[PDB]
């Protein structure tokens, strides 16, 4: 079961400071070390620091400018990272992995997207995308839903609560004035529509908002 | 019999050592005494005072842990001997 | 601190072929090298541990090799799913360190794009909006062009595109062009077309529709 649980995202005002979490479950040990890796978009993984909960000792990466402070809640099995006084540069995905003390990072977390900006958390907008009542069709049919006017990243768009994975393409958002816009596509067999439902699920961690929107043909 | 006791205690120093050693060594750049397993191999050969040098402490508390482990080895050893000695001396008193 | 150098940054290989990524340590680190795989918007995933040891859950396709300074991750018969990023990481000397990463790309057969066009939804129109979406799905190579024509004449204002990194489902590419306009601009304009010229056909691929 999903061992390291990390909050989907955090928005932070330049100068402000966020306290990222990582709550583990499963087999814990006194030799357990929780690590923090930071991955800037389109770049590699970068060790930030580490902490041994059963003792509370924490070491950080000596090359990067220390902007974090690790701590561990003995009982609740949660590791906390305190990233203070941030800037656009600190904006990235932060992972937390568990190390058994043998060197490798067995399992990682989902990662907490952190965006350092002045803007405001804008939940999205989900509009359907049904073919035009003038476009013919073959064995397959491509439907999809448009997620626009939201901020900040990320957004988790799924189809039929995830049950439908085959034939899906959620494109990368785009930034147009403090608002990200993306759209996902889905291709099912024409026969199976619109008889059998096809709804897209959009989750937006930064506002705990999650919507649906059944793709229904046009009257 | 205190030699027996010595063996128990040692095995404990051998573990606490491995632990502390890694706890002390991490953080000091270049340190290689940073993973629990080999840590233990490290403590074993340092206690047996064989110390090949494939692993050695570089920090202060790391070295302190080291010293302690060395002495648990050099003592148990001596205590088992001191034991053996007595046994043969008694056996011999016949 | 040990420096893990990973060359090359990208590997172009054909399906079912055998591919090898190399990681080079700035100094001897024994076999204390470990390899992680990270897909598009995924987290890292332990593949091999200690240069050549299996992890339960990883295909037998993956194998590790080497010792000292030169290590080699290897995939026997690549396949769509294997498209990701490959990083190596040592734990010989503190602090642990990572490699620069290596992108794996597959070489599937040419594929023409599936084009689909969508009129803005009434829900959006109900709020001064008007977004005309067009998809250029599952094609290959990645090179492709999208043009718009609102009423016989070409348009370029309000067109935002977005591409997808190589797909791990079939090793193809897909692109999405969105033409946002006000309900107004959209009101006084009959037909909207979306032409996609791809390397797979001299002529372009068209898909339009009228506001009515
Ligand atoms: K000796
Ligand atoms: K010696
Ligand atoms: K020696
Ligand atoms: K020696
Ligand atoms: K030597
Ligand atoms: K002796």
Kindly give the residue spans of alpha helices, DSSP state H, lying in chain C.
Answer: 122-125, 183-187
Instruction: Please tell me what DSSP assigns to residue C49.
Output: B
Residue C70 and residue C66: Cα distance in Å, rounded?
6
Say whether C94 and B28 touch across the interface (CB within 8 A).
yes
Rounded (10°) CA dihedral C45, C51, C55, C58 = 60
Say whether C92 and B26 touch across the interface (CB within 8 A).
no
Residue C37 and residue C168: Cα distance in Å, rounded?
13
Please identify among residues 69-108 of chain A the ones whose CB lies closer than 8 Å to any CB of chain C. 95, 97, 103-108
Three-state SS across chain A? CCCCECCCEEEECCCCCEEECCECCCCCCCCCEEEEEEECCCCCEEEEEEEECCCCEEEECCCCCCCCCEEEECCCCEEEEEECCCCHHHCEEEEEEEECCCCCEEECCCCEEEEECCCCCECCCEEEECCCCCCCCCCEEEEEEEEEEEECCCCEEEECCCCCCCCEEECCCCECCCCEEEEEEEEEEHHHCCCCCCEEEEEEHHHCEEECCECCCCC
| Per-state percent for chain C, helix, strand, coil, to nearest 5 | 5, 45, 50
Residue A5's beta-bridge partner residues?
A23
The answer to whether the beta carbons of residues A18 and A123 sit under 8 Å apart is no
Q: Using the Cα atoms of residue C11, residue C13, residue C16 and residue C22 in order, give the sign of their dihedral.
A: negative
Distance B67 CA to ligand 3 centre (A): 15
The answer to whether the beta carbons of residues B26 and B39 sit under 8 Å apart is no
Say whether C94 and B35 touch across the interface (CB within 8 A).
no
- If we measure between CA atoms, which residue out of A191, A42, A208, A57 comes closest to residue A124? A208
The answer to whether the beta carbons of residues C79 and C94 sit under 8 Å apart is no
Query: Closest-CA residue in chain C for A96?
Result: C43
Q: Which residues of A touch C135 (CB under 8 A)?
A: 142, 144, 169, 185
- If we measure between CA atoms, which residue out of C117, C122, C111 comes closest to residue C177? C117
- Determine whether domain B1-94 maps to CATH 3.40.190.10: no
Q: Tokens for C111, please give them.
A: 């594929």
> Residue B92: CB partners within 8 Å, gap ≥ 6?
none
Tokens 């990682």 — which residue?
Answer: A108
Given phi > 0 = left and psi -120 to 50 = alpha, else beta, which region is A111?
left
Kindly give the residue spans of alpha helices, DSSP state H, lying in B1-94.
Answer: 2-25, 36-47, 60-92
Please identify among residues 3-32 of chain A the ones whose CB lies closer than 8 Å to any CB of chain B. 31
Residue A52 and residue C54: Cα distance in Å, rounded?
26
Instruction: Please tell me what DSSP assigns to residue C204.
Output: P
> What are the angstrom distances between the C-alpha of A146 and each of A143, A157, A181, C211?
10, 10, 8, 19
Q: Tokens for C140, please give them.
A: 């290959």
> Residue C100: CB partners within 8 Å, gap ≥ 6?
A44, C4, C5, C6, C9, C87
β-pair type (A92-99, A105-107): antiparallel
Which domains are assigned to chain A?
Answer: 1-118 (2.60.40.10), 119-217 (2.60.40.10)
- If we measure between CA atoms, which residue out of C167, C161, C157 comes closest to residue C189? C157
Residue B43 and residue A100: Cα distance in Å, rounded?
19
- If we measure between CA atoms, which residue out of A91, A85, A50 comes closest to residue A71? A50
Q: Which of A55, A102, A103 sits opposite B23 (nearest CB)?
A: A55
* Chains touching B by CB (3 or more pairs below 8 Å): A, C
Residue B31 and residue B15: Cα distance in Å, rounded?
19
Cβ pairs A/B, distance under 8 A: 20
Residue A204 and residue C184: Cα distance in Å, rounded?
30
Distance B51 CA to ligand 4 centre (A): 6
**Residues of chain B contacting A, Cβ within 8 Å:** 19, 22-23, 26-27, 29, 35-37
Distance C51 CA to ligand 3 centre (A): 29
Distance B45 CA to ligand 3 centre (A): 9
> What are the angstrom distances between the C-alpha of A104 and each of A125, B76, C2, C95, C208?
41, 35, 16, 12, 54
Residue in A6, A9, A104 to test binding to C, most C beta-carbons within 10 Å:
A104
| CA B23, chain centre distance (Å) | 17
> What are the angstrom distances between the C-alpha of A32 and each of A52, A95, B22, C83?
6, 16, 12, 31
Q: How far apart are the first and last CA of chain B?
A: 22
| CA C132, chain centre distance (Å) | 24
B11-42 in b/e form (b: 16+ CB < 10 A) is eebbeebbbbbbbbbbbbeebbbbbbebbbeb
Residue in B27, B31, B61 to test binding to A, most A beta-carbons within 10 Å:
B27
Residue C89's beta-bridge partner residues?
C34, C98
| CA A19, chain centre distance (Å) | 16
Which domains are assigned to chain C?
Answer: 1-108 (2.60.40.10), 109-211 (2.60.40.10)
Residue A190 and residue C163: Cα distance in Å, rounded?
26
């Amino acid at each position: 079961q999903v061992q390291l649980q990390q909050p989907g995202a955090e928005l932070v005002k330049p100068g402000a400071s966020v306290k990222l979490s990582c709550k583990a479950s499963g087999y814990t040990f006194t030799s357990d070390w929780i690590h923090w890796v930071k991955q800037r978009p389109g770049h590699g993984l970068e060790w930030i620091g580490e902490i041994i909960p059963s003792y509370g000792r924490a070491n950080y990466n000596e090359k990067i400018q220390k902007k974090a402070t690790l701590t561990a809640d003995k009982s609740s099995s949660t590791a906390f990272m305190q990233l203070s006084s941030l800037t656009s540069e600190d904006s990235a995905v932060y992972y937390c992995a568990r190390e058994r003390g043998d060197g490798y990072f067995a399992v990682w977390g989902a990662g907490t997207t952190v965006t350092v900006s002045s803007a405001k958390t804008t939940p999205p907008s989900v509009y359907p995308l049904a073919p035009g009542s003038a476009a013919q069709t073959n064995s397959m049919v491509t439907l999809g839903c448009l997620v626009k006017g939201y901020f900040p990243e990320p957004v988790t768009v799924t189809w039929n609560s995830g049950s439908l994975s085959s034939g899906v393409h959620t494109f990368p958002a785009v930034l147009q004035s403090d608002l990200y816009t993306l759209s996902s596509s889905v291709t099912v067999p024409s026969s199976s529509w619109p008889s059998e439902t096809v709804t897209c699920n959009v989750a937006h961690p930064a506002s705990s908002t999650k919507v649906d929107k059944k793709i229904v043909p046009r009257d | 019999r205190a030699a027996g006791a010595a063996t128990v205690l040692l095995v404990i120093v051998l573990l606490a050592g491995s632990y502390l050693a890694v706890l002390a060594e991490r953080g000091a750049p270049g340190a290689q005494l940073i993973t629990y397993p080999r840590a233990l191999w490290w403590s074993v050969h340092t206690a047996t005072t064989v110390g090949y040098g494939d692993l050695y402490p570089v920090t202060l508390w790391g070295r302190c842990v080291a010293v302690v482990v060395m002495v648990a080895g050099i003592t148990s050893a001596g205590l088992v001997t001191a034991a053996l000695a007595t046994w043969f001396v008694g056996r011999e008193q016949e | 601190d040990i420096l893990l150098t990973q060359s090359p940054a990208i590997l172009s290989v054909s399906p079912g072929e055998r591919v090898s990524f190399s990681c080079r340590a700035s100094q001897s680190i024994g076999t204390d090298i470990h390899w992680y795989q990270q897909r598009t918007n995924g987290s890292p995933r332990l593949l091999i541990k200690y240069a050549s040891e299996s992890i339960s859950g990883i295909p037998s396709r993956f194998s590790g090799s080497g010792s000292g300074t030169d290590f080699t991750l290897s995939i026997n018969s690549v396949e769509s799913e294997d498209i990701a990023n490959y990083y190596c990481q040592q734990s010989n000397r503190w602090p642990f360190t990572f490699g620069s990463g290596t992108k794996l790309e597959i070489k599937r057969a040419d594929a023409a794009p599936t084009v689909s066009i969508f009129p803005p939804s009434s829900e959006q129109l109900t709020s001064g909006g008007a977004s005309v979406v067009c998809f250029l799905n599952n094609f290959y190579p990645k090179d492709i062009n999208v043009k718009w024509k609102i009423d016989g004449s070409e348009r370029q204002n309000g067109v935002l595109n977005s591409w997808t990194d190589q797909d791990s489902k079939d090793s193809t590419y897909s692109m999405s062009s969105t033409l946002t306009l006000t309900k107004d601009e959209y009101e006084r304009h009959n037909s909207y077309t979306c032409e996609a010229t791809h390397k797979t056909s001299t002529s372009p691929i068209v898909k339009s529709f009228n506001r009515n």
